[PDB]
Scaffold this motif. Structure first.
Motif, PDB file in Angstrom:
ATOM      1  N   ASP A 198       0.854  -1.203   0.000  1.00  0.00           N
ATOM      2  CA  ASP A 198       0.000   0.000   0.000  1.00  0.00           C
ATOM      3  C   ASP A 198       0.876   1.234   0.000  1.00  0.00           C
ATOM      4  O   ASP A 198       1.453   1.569   1.034  1.00  0.00           O
ATOM      5  N   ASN A 233       5.027   4.555   3.114  1.00  0.00           N
ATOM      6  CA  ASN A 233       4.759   5.984   3.059  1.00  0.00           C
ATOM      7  C   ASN A 233       5.711   6.585   2.026  1.00  0.00           C
ATOM      8  O   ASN A 233       6.939   6.546   2.180  1.00  0.00           O
ATOM      9  N   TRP A 283       1.193   5.040   0.153  1.00  0.00           N
ATOM     10  CA  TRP A 283       0.290   6.022   0.754  1.00  0.00           C
ATOM     11  C   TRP A 283       1.086   7.240   1.190  1.00  0.00           C
ATOM     12  O   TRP A 283       2.303   7.266   1.260  1.00  0.00           O
ATOM     13  N   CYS A 321      -3.022  12.122   1.234  1.00  0.00           N
ATOM     14  CA  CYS A 321      -3.832  11.397   0.297  1.00  0.00           C
ATOM     15  C   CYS A 321      -5.123  10.926   0.951  1.00  0.00           C
ATOM     16  O   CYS A 321      -5.174   9.921   1.695  1.00  0.00           O
ATOM     17  N   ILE A 366      -1.038   8.015  -6.088  1.00  0.00           N
ATOM     18  CA  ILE A 366      -1.528   7.167  -5.006  1.00  0.00           C
ATOM     19  C   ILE A 366      -2.998   7.430  -4.773  1.00  0.00           C
ATOM     20  O   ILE A 366      -3.518   8.533  -5.098  1.00  0.00           O
ATOM     21  N   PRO A 367      -3.743   6.476  -4.206  1.00  0.00           N
ATOM     22  CA  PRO A 367      -3.286   5.120  -3.807  1.00  0.00           C
ATOM     23  C   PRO A 367      -2.823   4.299  -4.977  1.00  0.00           C
ATOM     24  O   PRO A 367      -3.448   4.276  -6.049  1.00  0.00           O
ATOM     25  N   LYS A 402       2.609  -1.273   4.307  1.00  0.00           N
ATOM     26  CA  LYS A 402       2.381   0.150   4.068  1.00  0.00           C
ATOM     27  C   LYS A 402       3.696   0.839   3.841  1.00  0.00           C
ATOM     28  O   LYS A 402       4.604   0.785   4.679  1.00  0.00           O
ATOM     29  N   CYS A 440      -6.245   7.286   0.169  1.00  0.00           N
ATOM     30  CA  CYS A 440      -5.436   6.339   0.906  1.00  0.00           C
ATOM     31  C   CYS A 440      -5.981   6.080   2.293  1.00  0.00           C
ATOM     32  O   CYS A 440      -6.041   4.962   2.808  1.00  0.00           O
TER      33      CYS A 440
END
Length: 107
Positions: free
Chosen positions: A26, A59, A28, A32, A75-76, A57, A35
């Motif tokens: 993910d 970042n 993110w 966002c 993103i996402p 995740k 997200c």
């Protein structure tokens, strides 16, 4: 638990590419909105698969190398990864049932 990990550029190889099972990456950032909207659903997926799926995740404000490597253009962005290889990618938010079906489709 939700099987959700905070992964960095330095830990990506170990945490994602050398992971067992299926990884949902993910990408993110705090700016966002979408997200953040899908975050609960992702955690729910992690819980529902009971350790068979790891939600990694990343970042993208703190970790620029990994989204660059994977040609993240917005993103996402989500990726399914297994055995160090990308299976598929999704761009943009989706509803929980569609996210879950996508994960299931990886088998």
């Amino acid at each position: 638990s939700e099987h959700t990990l905070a992964v960095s550029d330095s830990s990506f190889d170990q945490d994602v590419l050398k992971a067992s099972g299926l990884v949902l990456v993910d990408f993110w950032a705090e700016w966002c909105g979408p997200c953040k909207m899908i975050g609960p659903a992702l955690g729910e997926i992690g819980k529902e698969f009971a350790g068979k799926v790891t939600v990694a995740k990343v970042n993208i404000d703190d970790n620029p190398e990994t989204p660059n490597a994977y040609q993240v253009r917005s993103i996402p962005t989500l990726m399914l990864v297994r055995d160090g290889k990308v299976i598929d990618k999704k761009v943009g938010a989706l509803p929980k049932s569609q996210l879950k079906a996508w994960v299931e489709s990886a088998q």
